[PDB]
């Protein structure tokens, strides 16, 4: 579970000293004067003579124009760190505001201390100016290669979701959350402010939103900044929010009376913060109003107020480089060399170029450093889970009365898994949907846990398995639950969510976005530990979507995630659970994985069981394997055809295939695709099948029938070089439905028993078969007009059963 | 265009020094005196022994009711001056006040530079008294001969047209503008007053106005001392200002008192217009209320309460002279005397008549002093305009057609 750190929730009892505020302003004159230095310097970075525009770099990278607020924010977090002893991370939603958290990390000491090229001193300055967002060294934004990040900020508006995700299970945990006003715009972030009906202050640690009401996006003004004051605040106050304003750096206040006032209300601020928590010891049944901060300074604070007449202080005009070529002219040069020097490096670094000791005598220390926190670099406070004997769970009815037996929904034993994981693991575990989590089949866990809810109670005939703390969050909102996930896996606990197939979708962005954080991570940032799987169930699949019909059929979730599988990563995992005993073992091996994105495809509809635990076990390894119990071919020269599937459905039809073929005395082998991957280039994935391996399942030169949950074209491309490849015939989705049978919505995707059987038979000789193909044809608008009659699919599709039933 | 003077708009940050307003209850004294001076005085003007019937001018001319008015604003004006570095060009509306315009520039050391012949001495003194308003001598208004004005005020009622058109695409410049309160009654005035419709605090300059509402116009009282405070302020406030009053020299609250109170108001008020200026870098779309004052003073502050058992001080009875011949009566000059003599003149004096440094120690210096700013001598700001070429708008048509030829207004053309 998390670790208490600190002395948390401590108030100060005393004025902020005058040394720390003088502490603070050498901080936010030499952040940003380090921020400049990486923007603007290749060389001579405390400009000595001579300082001239050969030191510029040829092309400037990066973003002035957040900087200065971030640097003068971050300042007096550190002060407050080091006053109060607290546990604190960051989230830095204005992630293009890199230049600060690189700063903050040099400064703090965490950066040489990881990055030991980078020494405190003139030539470790030299390269720490020249490396920012350059050919071979760091990137532009608050990237994981950075001490102290969680978050990269990249793509805006998760800032919320994964501050709140960050303190859930975690009660001594202190999140200042700066939010861009231009990214409270965002669809995820607006929703994100309602994430504190979902914590609770005991259980949970506390999230103070700052909103970085700087008045200006890329190249507009920000609606919050445009909107009345009153406005502004009673939508803070509408959210639960108490908001407190700052105002600064639009008038000539001295910086020494700024930094005063902003102690003074940060200090309110926390002793609001620390009421609340006191409170929460005895009163956690109602909900208190969350101070904010809204933070209102000029966009580029510091920049020089106008170049080239146009205003560069407090526009949008200072959002990337307030000047915008300082190598081209000399004009420009100077601007850049008064802007160097308005910070007054030669009283903040001493003759060697280390930063002086009395900048940064008020900084924090040890693990309380933002770069050293073990929140920040979760994969070292991540244990195992605690798991449960995976054969207490296990379908036995297979092994009593054959493969295919029964009509269990699959996701209620992932359910009864996880509900025992959760029991074992109290604070270590979380699930998260979106109002899914029942649908879905996932609601054994309301045995041992809540859903926790903490906005009003009414009712006990409405309210059942609500608590104000518990392992469940449910918001509608899927931007929500990736994201509160997200953020609990980046602190070192453990869970899974759950969505509908095709509402994936909605988070495509945000899964690729942790999984480029999991690609930096994993090729190139060593010191930053593993952390655990970003586990989703994906279920009420686009098969068993004939109720909602056509426009909830999208499995297209699979599509994306083979976009991030390359370079012998392994951060995507890509499985198809078969039937119950395969979800098992997929489920444990996900619950044991680190540093992946795992989709786990599974059915909640009735359905056979078609494997053991431990012949889904031996077939999970491998990826792919036979089914020799389903084939009647011996071994694969007389086989005539191979009848694979990837997916519960695919699987149901391809074994209803199967039995009418076998009627019929074709000599087939049947194989079943469990790990998608599997079937990647044995070149560019090493853990993928073998190419020898490869042909003794799929063959050599036969047919290959393959029914696929997803799209075809997932299949075709993945295959592209195997051998036999040309020979494969993949079906899957085509983009039809309608609200309709189950039977209907194979069949007019080409993937219904009759038509997989009729295609097995022109494979292996379209002509000697001419007649009994006319008959499945035949049968498949005869069954297809039986569910118009009567409303419901034809007795001999509903009343199958494998013939290894007995 | 318009220099930029000094560091305009700027807050003090600090409480006015107690030195500073022993300078400004200084300035106002001698001030006086000189005011006093220049119309009652012929020779003598140190009333050295004897000063008697002899020395007091044959013919009194001029205007005292406004003048210690004016004298006390244009001293906490000019400590407000050299603490801020502000701009600042003054608009003397009871323009009749003359002799507070002439002894600014006497004592801001602009006078003797302009004038060679009128020394910082007892001769230069004398010289200094005996011409004002005499034949050979200087105006009796706030005339273009004298360092610092832009605005003689003697037509009524231009202040604030004044005032405002001063500081258009000026935007350092501060305009503190002193409007009479009679002067308030004319139509020029009372529509002036809607000009900070008209005017952008970024672009622009600064205007305060001053209403000098000492009670009375010269007869009679004044209708917006008569009206009801209430009334007073709902107008300045349905005008677009924000008005702020003063009250003062109508008990007896001790001089330095009055000037404390007055200089905590003064920088109450320009706290608000460094605001207003700072908004205005940033949001200049939304019009500010502006500060006004209203100075609510006796008329003829500090002449003698009663002559002869007529109110004088706070009465119409002080508007031109409170005595009216202290030439021809015994009892007249020794009142004139005895109120030459209130504001001591043996402190403010040195032996050889030069006004005594820590009088004068509060003043700006340079350019910031008001006879001295050049937007109050502005042909010295002016240049030659850019003109184009005047061929690029010839109508051709003439050498073309005829003369007399086309249907063209000719005002187009000026266009
Ligand atoms: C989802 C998304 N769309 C567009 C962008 C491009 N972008 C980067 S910075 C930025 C402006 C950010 O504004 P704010 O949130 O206002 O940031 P800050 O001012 O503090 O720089 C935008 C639009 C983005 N990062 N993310
Ligand atoms: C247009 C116009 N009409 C008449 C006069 C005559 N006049 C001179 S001073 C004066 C009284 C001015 O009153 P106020 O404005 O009240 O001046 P202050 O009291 O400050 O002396 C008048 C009526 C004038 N100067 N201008
Ligand atoms: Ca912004
Ligand atoms: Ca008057």
């Given at each position: 579970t998390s670790p208490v750190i600190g002395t948390p929730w401590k108030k100060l009892n005393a004025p902020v000293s005058e040394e720390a505020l003088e502490g603070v302003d050498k901080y936010w004159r030499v952040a940003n004067y380090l921020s400049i230095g990486q923007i603007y310097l290749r060389s001579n970075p405390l400009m000595k003579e001579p300082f001239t525009r050969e030191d510029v770099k040829h092309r400037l990278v990066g973003h002035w124009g957040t900087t200065p607020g971030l640097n003068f924010l971050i300042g007096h977090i550190n002060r407050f760190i080091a006053d109060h002893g607290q546990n604190t991370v960051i989230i830095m939603g204005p992630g293009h505001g890199g230049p600060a958290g690189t700063s903050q990390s040099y400064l703090d000491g965490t950066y040489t201390e990881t990055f030991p090229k980078i020494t405190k001193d003139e030539a470790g300055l030299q390269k720490f100016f020249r490396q920012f967002s350059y050919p071979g060294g760091i990137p532009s934004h608050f990237a994981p290669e950075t001490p102290g990040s969680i978050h990269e900020g990249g793509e805006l508006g998760y800032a919320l979701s994964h501050a709140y995700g960050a303190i859930m299970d975690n009660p001594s945990l202190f999140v200042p959350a700066i939010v861009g006003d231009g990214e409270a715009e965002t669809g995820p972030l607006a929703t994100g402010w309602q994430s504190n009906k979902l914590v609770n202050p005991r259980t949970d640690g506390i999230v103070l939103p700052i909103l970085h009401l700087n008045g200006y996006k890329i190249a507009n003004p920000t609606i919050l900044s445009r909107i009345s004051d009153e406005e502004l605040h009673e939508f803070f106050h509408g959210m639960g929010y108490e908001p407190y304003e700052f105002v600064a750096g639009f008038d000539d206040e001295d910086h020494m009376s700024i930094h005063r006032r902003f102690a003074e209300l940060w200090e309110t601020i926390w002793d609001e913060i620390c009421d609340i928590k006191a409170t929460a010891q005895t009163d956690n049944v109602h909900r208190p109003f969350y101070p904010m901060l809204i933070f209102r300074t000029p966009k580029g604070?510091?920049?020089?107020?106008?170049?080239d007449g146009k205003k560069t202080e407090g526009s949008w005009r200072s959002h990337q480089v307030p000047l915008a070529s300082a190598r081209d002219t000399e004009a420009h040069f100077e601007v850049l060399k008064n802007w160097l020097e308005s910070y007054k490096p030669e009283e903040l670094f001493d003759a060697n170029g280390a930063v002086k000791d009395d900048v940064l005598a008020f900084m924090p220390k040890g693990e309380l450093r933002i770069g050293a926190n073990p929140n920040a670099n979760g994969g070292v406070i991540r244990n195992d889970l605690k798991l449960p004997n995976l054969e207490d769970y296990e379908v036995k009815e297979v092994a009593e009365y054959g493969h295919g037996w029964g009509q269990l929904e699959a996701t209620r034993t992932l359910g009864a898994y996880t509900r025992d994981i959760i029991k074992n693991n109290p604070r270590d575990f979380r699930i998260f949907g979106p109002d899914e989590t029942a649908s879905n089949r996932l609601q054994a866990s309301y045995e041992v846990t809540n859903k926790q809810w903490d906005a009003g109670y009414i009712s006990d005939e409405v309210d059942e398995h609500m608590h104000v703390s518990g392992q469940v969050v449910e918001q509608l909102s899927e931007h929500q639950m990736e994201g509160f996930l997200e953020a609990y896996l980046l602190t070192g606990r453990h869970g899974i969510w759950s969505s509908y197939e095709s509402f994936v979708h909605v988070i495509d962005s945000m899964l690729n976005q942790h999984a480029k954080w999991l690609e930096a991570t994993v090729r190139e940032?060593?010191?930053?530990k593993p952390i655990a799987s970003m586990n989703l169930?994906?279920?009420?699949?686009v098969w068993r979507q004939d109720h909602n019909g056509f426009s909830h059929q999208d499995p297209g979730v699979t599509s994306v995630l083979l976009n991030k599988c390359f370079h012998n990563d392994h951060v995507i995992g890509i499985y198809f659970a078969t039937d119950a005993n395969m979800l098992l073992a997929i489920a444990e091996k996900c619950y044991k994985s680190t540093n992946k994105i795992n989709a786990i495809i599974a059915g909640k509809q009735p359905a056979a069981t078609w494997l053991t635990l431990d012949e889904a076990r031996a077939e999970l390894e491998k990826g792919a394997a036979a089914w020799d119990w389903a084939?009647?071919?011996?071994?694969?020269?007389?086989?005539?055809?191979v009848l694979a599937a990837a997916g519960d459905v695919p699987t149901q039809e391809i074994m209803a295939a199967s039995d009418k073929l076998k009627e019929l005395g074709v000599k087939f082998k049947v194989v079943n695709v469990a790990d998608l991957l599997s079937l990647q280039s044995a070149k560019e994935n090493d853990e993928a099948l073998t190419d020898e391996e490869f042909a003794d399942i799929f063959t050599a030169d036969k047919p290959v029938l393959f029914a696929y949950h997803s799209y075809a074209h997932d299949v075709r491309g993945l295959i592209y070089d195997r051998p036999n490849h040309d020979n494969f015939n993949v079906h899957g989705y085509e983009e039809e439905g309608s609200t309709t049978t189950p039977y209907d919505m194979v069949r007019v995707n080409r993937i219904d028993r009759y038509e997989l059987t009729a295609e097995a038979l022109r494979m292996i000789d379209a002509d000697k078969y001419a007649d009994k193909i006319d008959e499945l044809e035949k049968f498949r608008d005869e069954a297809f007009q039986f569910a118009v009659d009567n409303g419901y699919d034809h007795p001999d599709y509903t009343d199958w059963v494998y013939s290894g039933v007995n």
């Open positions: 604070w510091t920049c020089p107020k106008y170049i940032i060593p010191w930053r169930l994906v279920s009420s699949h084939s009647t071919a011996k071994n694969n020269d007389e086989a005539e055809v």
